[PDB]
Design a protein around this ligand. Structure first.
Ligand SMILES: [Zn+2]
Ligand SMILES: [Zn+2]
Lengths: 147, 147, 101, 243, 117, 202, 209
């Protein structure tokens, strides 16, 4: 297509208790990082490597239209299990999603929005290494992955 | 590693993994991991000396047993995904100088190679002399034997 | 004419075919039952080898009919067998190799 | 099938205000050579430059000519695109590209110019036939693939000749091309034999495939039983799956 | 040519975007959320390496010299300090094209020199 | 053999190995090592089959085809040879090494699964494990293929079940529609035919 | 280039002259075998800016039994054809009194034209051939057995011998590349003569439905 060809590869997260996919940079702004320098500071630990930089760039242009935290939570809450009648019912709903059902092993309570920021940026960081090919795809049967 | 071999702060069950190329370090206290004991090798010598074996030989009425062997740092439990960072020696034979050095770094020695076999495959005499499906069939027919 | 048909039906010249009766065995069986001496000259007339296969090939009937559509459809069904059966029973091979009485 | 990405070393988009600027060191030589007598620039020259590199290895491997690529790019996209290239003398083989001159006479430019690249690298189709991934060349040692001719003595003489074997199939265009043998060319895929050569060719090409999987092991199943299965399938007039 | 890289605005710290000055014909970068503009020094924008001949000596970490599981030879001495131990390994990289080339990492503390033969 | 594999391995470290056309350098290396090791186990097999006396009982069961094949004698006396998983030499389950004992990036014959011991002298510990990995692929196939070959056997029957040779000798399915004018095109039952040479051809 | 497009116009013309010969239309032996240079002499090399314009390539061949029947092979110059273009051709067939004719399309027919061909069954029949489907004669492939279209006299005598109804034969659908080649219409029966490795020859009959 005309858009698919120009953009390149876009990254998306599929969250628990959300009907369909959500773009990634929307998920970082939902966690309280407004600027793209802070968002890309959690995902890419060294800015002198442009190869990663070019990988993320098309995922900023898809999230370019929502620049604000409370706009972003509303972007998520629209897709929840049921759409909230009132807006602030959705923002209250999406924030309860990021607090509890989002990566609960990091933390469940309040200021964990920072603790969830690095590690969630680390999923997005390690998904790049397998896209660039600097690491091996994990093995489904490797018996160290089993409990 | 030194605190686990003295069992001070860290139970022998906790596994710890230094992955160099990706720069991570991982410490898993989680339940369900599967780990088997190995002898430890410092420099080219086993940490199992003769004085340890003389005390175990007399184990009756010494109140001296496996736990007192593990607590001396001679044996170590190593689960799977920590076997990726280890060099094992089949027997103490591989530790001696062969004049052509395959590896000089062996960090753990296995107790005996034939402990890789389960309970029903441990009854077969000379299992290494048989075609491989024939140790699998005996595993099936060893459970059906009248006794 | 049959050697030109075979090279059309069998390119790559694979000569191994599957046919109803074994000719080389039965020619070989009729040497032993009748005690034929191959060192000796044969008594078998070279015409009665020819007139006997022609009269044989009419008595092998896959398709029964008098129609020009039935005739043409037998000559095709027995084609590769009559070709084989005229190779081994040839009037020369009977005089030289087999020496049938 | 050779896409332009097969022969491409690297790609960069540059911003040139005027061609004689040549922010690159080397291009300035032959850039001026073409602009000593510049043609079809009458409208204006778009500033946004697309400069691609072509590995001489893959270029000489497929016997590709810079003039040949220049034609296919200019022909594929038309006059909306201008293309300029080196002589083989250049140790670094370069192909310059710019937006339409008369376009100066939405989509922006740098965006629209990157949209051209990601369309070219995949879609150019310099050579060959799309859907043909690879083609292997070897001399067959099996008497089935060996051309076997009746000599003047009537003997069978098995000849060794080079045969090609493709990964992926489009049968109708492969047959049509020159020097390719119309008669003996065949594919293993049935449906593309059905749509091209008919239902009779499927009746035969199916019993040639079934006889290959059955007799590959060395096993032997009679020809009568192969021919009935291929008769039951194709006797309705079209391919009848067993489903 | 260069593999280029990002630039960030100095006010809202967003991604600057390249754009063309039509009057002066000078490449600019402009954040889209403010009026901040900056002149392009590099003059290259989007660069893509398809042949992607990649230098692994940049990715290799000097800490690799501490792994027991890697082989080492005293055949190849260190190029810098002339140390005999060198711990060598292959690409260890997916999408490496075809490379069995060994990369060498010098042992002994803090040298970390990394060469290829 | 294991010395000719070390040269092929050393040639590839220095890049001196040139790829065969149509083959990745990994594909040309995995071929040259299989060309050597197969000749090894093909030579030691035929060197073991020359040594068997006329009174040998293996040779008695093999020569008459009663049971066993010439390749079972090779593995008993001589060498068991390469062990394969999914048609490829043993893969890397750990990171860049096959078992904890081997060093990362060992492509040598021992690390990748070649067993140089015969069932009689007995397999060494690791060769026992790789030999177990190559045998699991045999057990799995036998469990999987039977359920596919039985679902195909049922489909071929239900589609053809009613086709029959009518008294016209025309083969006709259940509707009277004509599958063939004569059965098998020659009209002959398949049990009484034999192989023959034409002898006019060629 | 124009050497390829001159070579393509050499196959298409040659392969069609084999259709007309195999359907039983009178075709001179010289027109069947043309060396490219002899073809390049008659129709003159490069089509583009050249004497062959893709028109005047038209072929008029008369049937063997009836000199009146004939047929046309039309080459449209357009990449795609449309009802306004065919209506030009049909107006020409009306002009010269024939019925049957062929159309060789470069790329494809507009979906509105395909039905327009069917729109006239009795008066005029027209057949769509893609420019590729004629680039090779599929009759000469090894997989395709010799096909022979059968007269009505022979189909009656056939179905009486085996005592068959028409619908008990195998079928070959009218959309089959070897049905188009021989210009076969629903209800005709074709005779497949193919060599076999058991019988040595075998004759299959396909109905066309
Ligand atoms: Zn800004
Ligand atoms: Zn050093």
């Amino acid at each position: 297509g005309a858009k698919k060809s120009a953009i390149g590869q876009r990254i998306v997260a599929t969250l628990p208790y959300i009907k369909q996919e959500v773009p990634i940079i929307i998920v970082f702004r939902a966690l309280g990082f407004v600027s793209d320098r802070d968002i890309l500071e959690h995902i890419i630990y060294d800015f002198e490597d442009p190869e990663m930089m070019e990988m993320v760039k098309p995922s900023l242009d898809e999230a370019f239209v929502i620049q604000e935290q409370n706009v972003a939570l509303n972007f998520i809450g629209s897709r929840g299990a049921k759409p909230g009648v009132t807006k602030e019912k959705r923002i209250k709903y999406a924030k309860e999603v990021l607090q509890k059902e989002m990566l609960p092993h990091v933390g469940v309570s309040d200021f964990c929005e920072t603790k969830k920021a690095y590690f969630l940026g680390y999923m997005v960081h390690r998904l790049l290494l397998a896209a660039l090919g600097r690491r091996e795809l994990d093995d489904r049967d490797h018996y160290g992955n089993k409990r | 590693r030194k605190l686990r071999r003295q069992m001070d702060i860290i139970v022998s069950e906790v596994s710890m993994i230094r992955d160099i190329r990706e720069r991570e370090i991982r410490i898993y206290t989680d339940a369900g991991r599967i780990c088997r004991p190995l002898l430890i090798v410092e420099k080219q010598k086993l940490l199992l000396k003769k004085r340890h074996i003389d005390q175990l030989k007399e184990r009756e009425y010494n109140n001296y047993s496996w736990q007192d062997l593990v607590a001396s740092g001679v044996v170590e439990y190593i689960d799977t995904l920590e076997e990726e960072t280890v060099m094992l020696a089949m027997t103490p034979d591989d530790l001696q100088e062969k004049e052509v050095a395959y590896c000089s770094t062996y960090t753990h020695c296995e107790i005996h190679p034939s402990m890789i076999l389960g309970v029903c495959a441990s009854i077969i005499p000379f299992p290494d002399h048989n075609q491989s499906p024939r140790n699998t069939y005996q595993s099936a027919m060893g459970k059906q034997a009248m006794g | 004419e049959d050697r030109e048909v075979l090279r059309v039906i069998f390119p790559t010249g694979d000569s191994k075919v599957v046919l109803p009766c074994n000719l080389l065995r039965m020619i070989w069986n009729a040497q032993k039952i009748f005690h034929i001496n191959p060192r000796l000259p044969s008594d078998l007339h070279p015409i009665k080898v020819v007139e006997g296969v022609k009269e044989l090939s009419k008595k092998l009937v896959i398709v029964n009919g008098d129609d020009p559509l039935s005739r043409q459809a037998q000559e095709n069904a027995t084609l590769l067998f009559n070709i084989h059966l005229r190779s081994t029973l040839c009037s020369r091979r009977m005089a030289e190799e087999f020496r049938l009485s | 099938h050779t896409t332009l990405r097969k022969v491409t070393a690297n790609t960069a988009i540059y911003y040139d205000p005027n061609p004689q600027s040549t922010v690159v060191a080397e291009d300035q030589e032959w850039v001026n050579v073409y602009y000593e007598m510049p043609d079809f620039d009458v409208a204006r020259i778009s500033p946004w430059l697309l400069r691609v590199e072509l590995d001489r290895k893959h270029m000489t491997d497929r016997k590709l000519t810079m003039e040949q690529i220049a034609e296919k790019i200019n022909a594929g996209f038309g006059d909306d695109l201008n293309c300029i290239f080196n002589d083989d003398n250049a140790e670094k083989l370069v192909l310059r590209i710019r937006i339409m001159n008369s376009d100066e006479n939405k989509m922006d430019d740098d965006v629209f110019l990157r949209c051209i690249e990601s369309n070219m690298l995949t879609d150019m189709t310099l050579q060959g036939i799309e859907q043909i991934s690879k083609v292997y060349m070897h001399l067959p040692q099996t008497d089935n693939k060996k051309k076997i001719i009746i000599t003047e003595d009537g003997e069978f003489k098995a000849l060794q000749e080079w045969i090609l074997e493709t990964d992926g199939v489009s049968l109708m265009r492969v047959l049509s091309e020159k020097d390719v043998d119309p008669v003996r060319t065949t594919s293993n895929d049935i449906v593309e034999i059905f749509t091209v050569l008919g239902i009779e060719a499927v009746r035969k090409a199916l019993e040639r495939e079934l006889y290959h999987v059955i007799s590959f092991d060395g096993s032997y199943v009679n020809y009568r039983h192969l021919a009935l299965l291929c008769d039951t399938m194709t006797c309705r007039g079209h391919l009848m799956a067993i489903t | 040519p260069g593999i280029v890289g990002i630039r960030f605005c100095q006010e809202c710290n967003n991604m600057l975007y390249p754009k063309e000055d039509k009057e002066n014909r000078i490449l600019l970068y402009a954040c889209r959320n403010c009026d901040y503009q900056q002149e392009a020094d590099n003059s290259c924008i989007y660069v893509n390496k398809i042949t992607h001949e990649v230098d692994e000596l940049t990715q290799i970490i000097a800490d690799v010299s501490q792994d027991p599981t890697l082989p080492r030879t005293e055949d190849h001495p260190c190029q810098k300090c002339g140390h005999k131990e060198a711990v060598f390994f292959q690409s260890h990289s997916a999408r490496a094209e075809d490379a069995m080339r060994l990369y060498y990492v010098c042992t002994a503390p803090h040298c970390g020199h990394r060469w290829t033969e | 053999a294991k010395q000719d594999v070390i040269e092929v391995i050393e040639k590839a470290h220095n890049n001196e190995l040139e790829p065969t056309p149509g083959n990745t350098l990994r594909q040309t290396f995995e071929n040259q090592v299989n060309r050597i090791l197969n000749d090894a186990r093909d030579k030691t097999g035929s060197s073991a089959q020359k040594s068997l006396s006329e009174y040998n009982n293996f040779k008695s069961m093999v020569v008459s085809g009663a049971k066993g094949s010439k390749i079972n004698i090779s593995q008993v006396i001589a060498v068991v040879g390469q062990q394969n998983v999914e048609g490829k030499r043993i893969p890397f389950g750990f990171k860049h090494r096959t078992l904890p004992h081997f060093i990362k990036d060992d492509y040598g014959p021992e690390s990748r699964g070649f067993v140089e011991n015969s069932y009689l002298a007995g397999l060494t510990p690791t060769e026992f494990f790789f030999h177990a990995m190559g045998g699991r692929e045999g057990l799995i196939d036998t469990a999987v293929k039977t359920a596919e070959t039985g679902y195909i056997q049922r489909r071929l029957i239900k589609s053809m079940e009613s086709v029959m040779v009518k008294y016209d000798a025309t083969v006709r399915n259940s509707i009277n529609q004509v599958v063939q004018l004569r059965y098998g095109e020659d009209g002959l039952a398949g049990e009484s035919v034999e192989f023959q040479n034409l002898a006019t051809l060629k | 280039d124009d050497e390829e497009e001159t070579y393509r116009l050499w196959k298409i013309r040659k392969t069609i002259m084999q259709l007309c010969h195999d359907r039983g239309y009178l075709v001179t032996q010289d027109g069947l075998d043309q060396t490219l240079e002899e073809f390049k002499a008659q129709f003159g090399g490069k089509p583009s800016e050249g004497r062959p314009r893709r028109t005047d390539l038209t072929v008029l061949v008369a049937h063997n039994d009836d000199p009146t029947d004939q047929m046309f092979v039309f080459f449209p110059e357009e990449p795609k054809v449309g009802i306004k273009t065919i209506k030009v051709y049909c107006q020409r067939m009306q002009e010269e009194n024939i019925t049957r004719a062929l159309i060789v399309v470069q790329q494809g027919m507009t979906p509105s034209a395909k039905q327009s061909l069917v729109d006239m069954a009795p008066k005029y029949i027209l057949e769509q051939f893609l420019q590729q489907e004629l680039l090779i004669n599929i009759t000469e492939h090894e997989l395709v057995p010799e096909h022979v279209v059968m007269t009505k006299e022979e189909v009656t005598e056939l179905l009486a011998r085996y005592k068959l109804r028409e619908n008990q034969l195998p079928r070959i659908q009218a959309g089959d590349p070897v049905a188009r080649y021989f210009g076969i219409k629903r209800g005709q029966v074709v005779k497949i003569i193919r060599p076999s490795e058991t019988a040595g020859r075998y004759i299959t009959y396909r109905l066309v439905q």
